[PDB]
Swiss-Prot record, chains A, B:
Annotated GO MF terms: metal ion binding; tRNA-guanosine(34) queuine transglycosylase activity
NCBIfam families with a match to the protein in the record: Q_tRNA_tgt, tgt_general
InterPro entries according to UniProt: ArchSynthase1/Queuine_TRR, TGT, TGT-like_sf, tRNA_ribo_trans-like
Effect of residue 264 to N: Abolishes catalytic activity
Protein name: Queuine tRNA-ribosyltransferase
Active-site residues, as the UniProt record annotates them: 92, 264
Positions bound to substrate: 92-96, 140, 187, 214
Protein source organism: Zymomonas mobilis subsp. mobilis (strain ATCC 31821 / ZM4 / CP4)
A biological-process GO annotation: queuosine biosynthetic process
Residue ranges the record marks as coiled coil: none
Region (RNA binding): 245-251, 269-273
């Protein structure tokens, strides 16, 4: 098995489908990565996550470095062994989470000091190494939205300097360089010239994959798509393109249409526990009284184990009762739905009918 | 498959081991019944409950009659279909829960009026019929502890009149009488003469099984065993003996030594979510800092899936983080532990070495 090999099997417009082969397994692209909060995909055993079709999950550097700690996880055999997921894991760099979740933050050229510590590109890489991550993210800065061009520029420039430092730290660790991959993160807010400068900088350094950062920060779908329109083509075509923190099914479809290969979002897990179930006819809230005596499964096409066995009425009852099994069943279905969406996207690109799929999907989903 | 056939395969002193054959499956005795709160064994899919070795679960008449309602469950196909458990289900009568959980209660010869309705023996039987219960419990009154002999007597006497009414209501419903079994409940507090009068009354009516009610209500283990000492022999030998609401592993072993065949308790599920894990060396609280880097499974003999895959350190982390998977893994292990205990009890009685097992179990469990 190779360390990291990306192959594009088919294209339709800007959309691509293919595979990333890594030592711990193959990732089918476009891919959706279920998010692990504290070394767990919430309410799911790893075997269940795999059963939904997931090829890779995301682990959180920020949370894990605090609890149970990176050194501790390393001492216990690494994240894979710790949580019982033996397939690839992508870890975030901590760059976004440190600014989003920390009570107080001090930013400087060295990195970020915070109250739940000091995250730097070097420390981020080290933490991800200690976790045993397969895909390591460069330490970046997610520019707040909106930003002046000047603020966006100085922020993106710092991120690019941090990207080079991340590259060097990663390359310095022989075992990491041998067995893991490193992705760079494009910044530049909504500005085409800065996105270009960022892409150029990242390409000059050279990464295994490129993330489009700085989006899904309140700009809205139209604006996000507008920025993706020009940003993705700036990235190397022959490497995977990862859109961080996205998103709703419609966001995913549109992003794929614009050349994105990888996604992660808390939406299917989070909103699942909240009562939101995804269906091909759009999301439903299972708590609604309308479902109290509905014997149909959450979605009548869905192939997941939940839809094979349990009714809307039962899941309605569980969620209204605050029962853990409610969260379990909703989460498994939603993740499975996301995986089925990705499978349909992959199949349609490979068959050269993705445009029709996107149209058909939207017509029904927003009926 | 028979409606209800109890066979005793082996005995050792007062202990018995055998089987109850019912239409929906075989129950190995002595049996432990995981408790379903609101049509769910908390944090477990039914397939997982079955995987732990459970042959039968307990469903709660009191909770289900309120949410989602008995008629509603019947309309949705019955409790088995609703929750996806196709094996036997025993339902409590509501007699104890109505007094324990209701904000206000009015007691009379008709039954109990309460604020979350009016439960009577007839209504209780009807509700259990609507749920589709396999083992139906007579509607009783659990006398508070302590009670004067006179209060205990009038209470037990009412329960006996209610037992006859439960019998008649059950027998009146052809489909229930054909497919389900009915258990009577002995009362009489801690008084030998009243326990005898209660047993006589129940035997004269005639039931498929007999529960020892009115225990595990704060009397303590010594007193409970003292009462079991004389109470169980009063019950028909050729029918199953069910001790309601018991209990800790040591309570179960002692009760089996005194002729009890069936148990249910919230302990393994409840305390599991709270961080308490059962082991052969006694219970542990997985939240304790001592387990933070412990790579051993919860118990090093346990055959459950949790102990095959995950460490104490990981489960420690999950429970301290408030993660649902923590509750899932703890609950599966604890239920599996209880089932392994029951299997060891069954094997040792069948092999005529139960006395030695009980001694060996206690020496190690309370080391
Ligand atoms: C939910 N929306 C969202 N946008 C994001 C952007 C970044 C980003 O630019 N960098 C890093 N490191 N994580 C991110 C996570 C995001 N999550
Ligand atoms: C946890 N201790 C406990 N003792 C019990 C006694 C009875 C009893 O006498 N009757 C009915 N119906 N349920 C019961 C449930 C119990 N639960
Ligand atoms: Zn489904
Ligand atoms: Zn176990």
């Amino acid at each position: 098995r190779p360390r990291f090999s990306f192959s594009i099997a088919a294209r339709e417009g800007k959309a691509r489908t293919g595979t990333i082969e890594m030592k711990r397994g193959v990732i089918r692209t476009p891919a959706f990565m279920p998010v692990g909060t504290a070394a767990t995909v919430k309410a799911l055993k790893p075997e269940t996550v795999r059963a939904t079709g997931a090829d890779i999950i995301l682990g959180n550097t920020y949370h894990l470095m605090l609890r149970p700690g990176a050194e501790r996880i390393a001492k216990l055999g690494g994240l894979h062994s710790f949580m019982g997921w033996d397939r690839p894991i992508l870890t975030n760099s901590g760059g976004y989470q440190v600014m989003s979740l920390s009570s107080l933050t001090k930013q400087s050229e060295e990195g970020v000091t915070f109250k739940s510590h000091m995250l730097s590109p070097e420390r981020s890489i080290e933490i991800q190494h200690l976790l045993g991550s397969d895909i390591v993210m460069a330490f970046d800065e997610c520019t707040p939205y909106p930003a002046t061009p000047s603020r966006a520029a100085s922020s993106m420039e710092r991120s690019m300097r941090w990207a080079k430092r991340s590259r060097d730290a990663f390359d310095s660790r022989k075992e990491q360089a041998e067995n893991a991959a490193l992705f760079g993160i494009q910044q530049g807010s909504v500005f085409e010239n800065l996105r270009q400068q960022s892409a150029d900088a990242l390409a000059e350094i050279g990464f295994d994959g490129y993330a489009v950062g700085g989006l899904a920060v309140g700009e809205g779908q139209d604006e996000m798509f507008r920025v993706l329109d020009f940003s993705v083509p700036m990235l190397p075509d022959d490497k995977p393109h990862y859109l961080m923190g996205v998103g709703k099914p419609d966001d995913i479809v549109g992003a794929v249409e614009r050349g994105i290969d990888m996604f992660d979002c808390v939406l299917p897990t989070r909103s699942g526990r909240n009562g939101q179930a995804f269906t091909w006819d759009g999301p439903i809230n299972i708590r609604n009284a309308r479902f109290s005596e509905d014997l149909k499964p959450l979605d009548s096409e869905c192939h997941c184990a939940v839809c094979q066995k349990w009714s809307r009425a039962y899941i309605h009852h569980l969620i209204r009762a605050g029962e853990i099994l409610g969260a379990m069943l909703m989460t498994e279905h939603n993740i499975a739905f996301y995986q089925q969406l990705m499978q349909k996207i992959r199949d349609s690109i490979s068959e050269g009918r993705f445009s029709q799929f996107a149209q058909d999907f939207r017509a029904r989903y927003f009926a």
